[PDB]
Symmetry: D2
Subunit: 300 residues, 4 copies
């Protein structure tokens, strides 16, 4: 099933266009560092500001670069059911392993609306489907009872990126759902507490920067080394916090740009960090590289 | 001069397409019932599930039906700045009075991001612009100081649909902004308290059903008749409540469909009301008409 | 019926004890400036840090000084039903006009618990009772249905200080309760919007400093002058805001001490303002006095 | 240090008095089932509705019964600093191992106020002190920087019962404070995730009913057996959830009464469960016992 560490990749831009050299190198750095899979064109990838063909083209490059070496679950959700079906269908044609479907944002559908929304997309594809609950961005929550009904009637709904900020929600999901069902953390700071109560991995932002250390955190816990896992969690925790110092993906793309790895190009309405937050992030980036160097036996 | 009652109209559907005949009828019913203007293709018009071409077409039809008899502020916002600019220009070409720009939803831009987003659209158009603050659907709020800078640096930002659920926010806006800035209620149930501290009208959902009473509520306060306005507020209040019994526009479109004015056609992810909520809506509708019949001198 | 402006007075302290001269001066200033009544030893009076006998003495001193010239509703609430009964009976023996009963804080009773709590206190006394809903401090809200049941069964429950921060609560309360039931603002900044949907007065903090203008604000609205009322509201609004810059009563007691009217003696766990908030309060105080002088025809 | 499972005990009442034989039975059952210590007269013990005599007497009886076999940390907090000092000093003379200090409730002191409040109580006793953060009941949060300042200046402040409902707060606490500082879960459902990021125990409600399974949950994680701890967590999670179905201690005391172990004598304002919630608890209780049987090798 679906377990481990998945990277929600940024969409690297150069001169107003997709920077393909940047994507290749970033994808290679992930594959080389024990990452289980990639989520292209989600929130971290600035999907709202991609054109439709850029959305499709970003999934196409990712598939071509990765060449089946690790898994790809493309972000293909929408707050239009028809649009999510069309985006999901186009991803299946490219040749992905599955899709990640954020719950409809902004129009706040009822739970029965969510049931028919996700069932209509699930029925439209043979692809495995990960649901994605993030009330803070969407204005609506996928209730546990809705997830359970969805999985009862839709065999290809296999898991959930749970980003509700609530570890209690994970326990509720494990109580209500089969256990082949994969609960993944959607928040780097909460992965270890989610794993402790039955999640099996993470859709990560921080692994854009530190793929082997983030990936080691999950492996350490899953093989029964909770104290070494906690050690790595404490090492990365200040980074986990400052990667949301302003709205993701501005910190993580700024951080990659401070490394030689991408242009600091954002599409409006995202804007660069305010100067004091830029300095905090810069400092946390550096302490993080120091702290990791001292605990290298945990992750290298 | 932005003052009075503006109706956020439903988008009437028939057999999967825009129902032009129903749209004609709804618009004439508004014009004949003392409505100051129309807001096509906002939330109430199910903008997320319209195709781009449908979005422009609904705006074209509204303008063609209305012929300048009342004002039109078209919904042209997006969580992509480039997309909002393009929608706004298409509206300018159709020939509207102005544009209403919801804050970017889902990607949660920083305040500076919101400043640049709205500033770029304003600089792109000659139309007057109403900002639209609704964090429960967007996941972000337009801070008072951000509204203040927007108006300082963009002469065509002339008002706001304030739907943050907070009347105190209105007192802050009036304190921070020039008296000429027009604050409109975005929540029918808060219209009267917003007016009491300096708002000048409403972008209304309830006016879809009861245009004359909602419009009279605002006029009564503006003509210095607070106790009669309160009488009307209190007459309509249970209806205002039940138009949110599930996510707008499901109640209001269901109510119109029960009146024979449109098909009860909703695009997924919106779904019909739960049966117990349908019953509440039905009885509240009839109860409201019964009560309006008794206070006819206030609104008729 | 209970209407108009009631001042939740500070408990003036001097050298660790009740300051009787300061209390007398403050009470006389209230009586001279069109205040309808006094609420001694509520939150603004630091009820948590008074001894029982200090609690009894402040209520007795207030009754003795006022000598029935204006009304007294004494704060006698507790999160212990028995202690609230005892406090209420003591106030009745002193001879007040009524009592203000905050909902239980900290132990978070169910709605049925609230109904039994308030019903038991109401049954123990012939005094009129004002309920006091303030969820931000108590951790619980008095539901509208609970207020309605309490009034059905306890004829001496005559109103509520509504401090839930929600004007919509006022509309629900007026829907559910008879006209003789009095809803009072518990938040100076929301008094005017509360009035517009059916409140009939305020239990005020600001009136400690500016009794005539605050009481004029309420009278202006109740006599059908909504725009003079709004004008006074906007004149006072920044003061209303800064009297909550930190938890009441620190700002209002700090303001009165700056006027030489009481000692800035606070009992722990309350502490003086942070210096930046002190400066903001000081500057807002000065501006308010001059602005009030320029609209003196509205309140003098 | 302070590590493991401490039981926040109910206060067994009978006919308006302390049920001392029931207290003996409850205490012996804790000691016999691998419980590390007792927290008498906190929220679970209905401290708000105990007289002062009962508050002190319950701590004396607990101390006399326990005879130093396990630890006692008495609840001695108050929203009056002077009152907290007095309760804390009566516990010191009785001879407890420490005290638990809830933050002031209802009067919402500033952070600086919290600093002086807890520092003043810490200075008044040589006893170890656990802070107790529960904003949902108090209306105020003990900020991380405030905890950090308190510990810098008060050597006897040795840990915190963290009941803010945020696992992230634990990670922040570990980042900011010395490892010797003991963070204890204050929420049974969050104990395991708290432990995974560095908490070292629990102040538990559920251990009133299942002392050995709850204490085994903590021990298993602490001795590096995360998957067995997770098994026990999922066995108990529905009980953890339903012990908060209404405000603690109504569920736990109802459960104990149904087991014939104490009279369900609640002092108003606490009220018995709504009948549908009593039904949920009853079934969860039976299911919990059934499930505990199958993982008995984990906790027996």
């Amino acid at each position: 099933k679906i377990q481990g560490t998945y990277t929600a990749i940024i969409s690297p831009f150069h001169n107003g266009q997709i920077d393909r050299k940047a994507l290749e190198r970033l994808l290679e750095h992930q594959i080389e560092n024990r990452i289980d899979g990639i989520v292209p064109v989600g929130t971290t990838g600035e999907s709202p500001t991609l054109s439709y063909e850029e959305h499709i083209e970003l999934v196409r490059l990712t598939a071509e670069i990765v060449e089946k070496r690790i898994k790809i679950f493309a972000g293909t959700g929408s707050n239009s059911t028809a649009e999510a079906i069309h985006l999901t269908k186009e991803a299946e044609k490219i040749g992905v392993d599955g899709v990640l479907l954020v719950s409809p944002y902004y129009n706040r559908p009822s739970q029965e609306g969510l049931f028919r929304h996700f069932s209509a997309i699930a029925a439209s594809t043979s692809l495995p489907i990960l649901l994605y609950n993030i009330p803070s961005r969407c204005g609506v929550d996928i209730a546990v009872d809705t997830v359970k009904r969805l999985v009862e009637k839709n065999k290809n709904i296999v898991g959930i990126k749970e980003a509700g900020g609530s570890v209690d929600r994970v326990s509720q999901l494990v109580e209500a759902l089969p256990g082949e069902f994969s609960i993944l953390s959607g928040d780097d700071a909460l992965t270890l507490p989610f794993l402790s109560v039955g999640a099996v991995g993470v859709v990560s932002v921080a692994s854009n920067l530190f793929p082997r250390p983030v990936s080691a955190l999950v492996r350490l816990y899953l093989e029964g080394k909770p104290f070494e896992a906690r050690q790595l969690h404490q090492t990365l925790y200040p980074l986990f916090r400052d990667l949301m110092i302003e709205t993701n993906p501005v910190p993580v793309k700024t951080a990659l740009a401070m490394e030689g790895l991408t242009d600091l190009e954002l599409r409006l309405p995202l804007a660069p960090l305010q100067p004091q937050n830029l300095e905090k992030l810069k400092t946390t980036l550096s302490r993080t590289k120091e702290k990791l160097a001292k605990v290298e036996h945990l992750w290298a």
